[PDB]
Structure formats: C-alpha cells, structure tokens
C-alpha cells in the first residue's frame with residue numbers, strides 16, 4: 429500500500445534514534461505501508477543517512493526558514509516549534525492516509541489495521557482521558573487541514589504548549605464522537621501507565637501493540653547492558669525491546685557510515 | 688422523578704461524611720431525582736441518622752451476614768468486601784435507573800442529564816483510559832445483573848482487587864462501544880488529574896460537574912480553616928467546596944443529634 433504511510437518526526441539526533449528504532453520496529457512487524465520521517469536540518473547527516481535506510485521517505489522540514497509556511501506562526505509562537513514541524517505531517521499529500529507516531533513510540537505488533545480508521549483517530553491520553561494522546565494518530569494529509577491547523581496554532585496556540593493541545597483543540601469532537609476514533613489504548617500505551625494503574629497493565633498490557641515512552645527519561649537516555657540484555661536503574665521489558673532493536677538493528681546500521 | 692436515584696455507598700463513618708457531602712451537593716444543585724445511600728452496620732447511628740435526613744433512602748447492606756446473597760462470595764474473596772457491598776446498588780430495583788457515585792465524589796453542577804444515559808455509562812479512568820472509572824456510573828438496577836456481577840466476582844474476582852476491576856470486566860465493551868457510554872471526564876473528574884495533566888485541567892476543569900477525590904488523602908482527612916475557608920497543606924478549590932458544604936450543611940446537621 430504505497431499511498432499509506434507511518435509518519436514520524438525527528439528534530440534532533442536523540443529523537444532520530446527513537447525514529448530509527450520505531451521504523452525498525454514497524455519493519456520488524458512487517459508493515460505493508462510506507463515509512464516516512466519528517467526531519468529538521470538539526471538532524472545530523474549520519475542520522476539522516478541512517479533514516480534514509482530505515483524510512484522509505486525522509487522529508488526535511490525547516491520551520492526556521494522564511495520559506496516555510498509555518499515560519500510566521502513560529503515567530504508568533506516560538507514554543508510551538510516542534511508542534512509546527514509535526515503539523516507538516518499533513519503536508520504529505522503523496523499519502524492518502526497516515527498513522528503519525530512520535531519518535532518515542534515503539535511498535536510491538538503489526539498495526540496496519542490502523543489504516544482502517546479515519547482522521548482523526550487516536551488513543552485516549554492518560555491524565556486527561558477526554559483528550560487524545562497525540563503520540564499515535566490516524567490522519568489524512570491535506571494542505572487544507574494543514575492550513576487550518578496552522579491557523580488555529582496562530583490564533584489560539586496550544587493549551588498545553590505542545591502538539592497535543594493544538595490537535596485536541598482542532599479535532600475537538602474526539603471525546604464525544606465516534607468510538608471508532610478512540611484507538612484502543614494498546615495502540616499508544618503510555619509507559620507511565622505501567623505505574624499509574626499497574627493492575628490494569630497486568631490485566632491488559634500483554635496486548636500492547638505500541639508503547640509510548642513518556643516521562644522525563646527517554647529510552648535512549650537509559651544505560652543498556654548488552655550482556656544481560658536489560659536497562660539499568662522500572663518495568664524494563666519495553667525499554668529492553670527498544671534497546672534490543674537499537675542494539676541489533678540501529679547501531680550496526682549507523683556504524684557502516686564510518687567507512 | 689421517583690424511580691430514578693443517585694446512589695452512593697458508605698461502609699464507615701469517614702465515608703459517611705463524604706456521602707453526606709455528596710448528597711448535600713446533589714440537593715444543592717437541585718436534582719429532581721431520589722438520593723439513596725447503601726450503608727453497612729459499621730456506619731454508626733449518628734451518621735445513619737444524618738444520612739436519613741440527607742438521603743431519601745438509606746439501605747443497610749450487611750455482606751458479613753450469612754443471609755446476604757454476596758456473603759458466600761465474600762468468604763471466597765474477602766478483599767472484595769467493599770465491591771460486593773457496592774454491587775448491591777443493582778439490587779435497588781425500586782429504581783429504573785441510577786447514577787452510582789462513590790462517597791468520595793462531589794457534585795459541582797446539576798448532573799440529572801446523566802439519566803439520559805444507558806447502563807453502563809461511565810467516564811474514562813485516567814491511568815488506564817480504556818477502563819472506565821467506577822466512581823460515577825449510570826446503571827440499571829436488576830437482580831439479574833446483580834447475580835451476574837456476583838458470579839463474575841466469584842469466578843474471576845477483580846483484576847484490581849476493587850469494584851472498578853470487576854465492573855470493567857463485566858461491562859467490557861465500554862472502551863470499544865458506544866461513545867455515549869463514555870461519560871465526559873467532567874462528570875467524574877479525578878482530583879489527581881489536576882496534577883497529572885495540569886494544562887488540560889486549566890483548559891477544561893472549569894467545566895467540572897463532579898470531582899472525584901482520589902489518592903491517599905480523602906477530603907475529610909484534611910484540616911479546614913473555617914476563617915480563611917481553605918484546607919491547609921494542592922489546588923485546593925475542590926477540597927474547599929467539599930469542606931464548605933461539610934461545614935455549612937453537614938456538621939450542623941450532625942450536631943442536632945446530641946440534644
């Protein structure tokens with residue numbers, strides 16, 4: 429399916445690692461869809477070159493450039509830089525439908541059945557569950573929607589200073605409309621919810637299709653012991669999946685660029 | 688509307704205070720429905736007498752008694768005592784439809800529009816938002832459903848040792864079925880979500896219809912300064928509403944029993 433893609437975003441090298449693990453995880457679970465990554469010029473050439481191998485398409489977005497449609501909004505709302513860059517996922521009109529996934533998510537199972545969903549489908553955010561979590565969503569590229577989102581970003585900004593606020597504001601019927609636009613939580617399982625509601629994780633977590641690494645420490649911020657195959661200093665299994673992919677597939681990939 | 692009620696539960700004197708504040712809060716916001724409270728014999732006579740004034744119906748449930756239908760299940764699963772007592776809300780067949788509200792909830796606005804909903808309607812639980820939070824739900828009394836719930840309690844218990852696990856297990860299509868059975872989060876606003884996702888609270892919290900006091904410290908565990916009209920040692924406004932009702936309406940009510 430060439431006109432459908434998973435789309436992610438990396439604005440730096442640290443998140444490129446996440447994006448590389450994510451992309452690898454999607455390939456590992458045999459997606460039949462394209463993989464696209466939005467990148468900024470702040471992503472270094474070696475990460476970019478690795479991204480070009482993992483992803484079918486690497487799209488460079490430079491909202492710091494005057495030529496960018498989001499640039500004026502950036503000047504108005506400089507804290508929305510990441511948001512405005514992410515919003516360019518809607519510019520990818522070479523695709524009819526996409527699943528956006530933040531670079532700090534990890535695919536545990538094939539999730540191509542997401543492409544049955546309509547814009548805007550997303551899992552509930554823990555914390556304020558009448559908002560959707562913007563880490564994973566099904567959307568449809570459209571210059572119009574992009575422009576409309578830009579306009580809301582310009583006019584109202586984001587109630588949380590992030591892309592999630594903006595997206596919830598724009599796609600505001602999510603909470604009260606169409607249960608099919610509630611992605612099951614297992615398609616965007618907040619790593620924090622392992623703690624916040626442990627019995628529920630015990631009951632339903634084995635079904636996790638996507639893990640979303642939230643909180644202060646991102647997976648790449650951990651130390652991974654390659655001998656014991658575990659991160660150190662915590663329910664580590666998801667981190668360990670992330671690190672195994674990173675160790676097995678991503679590092680060896682980045683290593684071949686030194687030659 | 689005589690065949691519809693808000694129903695709560697108190698198993699002790701501390702929660703009776705909550706139940707009294709809840710009942711008062713419902714009267715304050717002019718419910719046209721009946722108010723029913725399930726009570727246990729562990730609730731003292733003075734609390735019971737106060738409950739008889741606030742609530743239209745005080746129902747005594749004694750699952751420790753052999754004569755109780757839930758009693759055998761209690762012996763099997765003694766940790767489910769509170770759950771099994773709460774499940775008796777389904778025994779209240781004098782009502783055609785009820786909103787169950789835990790005694791640690793607080794009504795901030797008329798919520799009689801809940802009676803438009805069907806069993807089982809409930810707000811998402813923060814933490815694991817594909818579970819509903821069992822603090823507030825619309826249900827329909829039925830001996831059959833009661834029996835079915837008892838049976839699931841007996842057979843499977845609760846994945847979280849509480850009523851929420853059991854109810855989610857029984858009413859398991861909630862996450863994926865019928866958006867109208869997702870009560871808006873503002874009908875069961877987790878006091879913890881004030882912290883967990885503060886920008887969202889800032890954005891949507893002013894619309895709170897029901898506050899659900901979760902976490903270690905219940906409202907009655909705080910110290911309330913009646914002069915400054917605030918609790919001490921925190922976004923205190925909801926606690927302060929709880930305490931104002933408690934101070935204005937509940938304490939004076941309990942005071943008239945000493946004569």
Ligand SMILES: [Cl-]
Nearest residue numbers: 606607865866
């Ligand atoms: Cl629906």
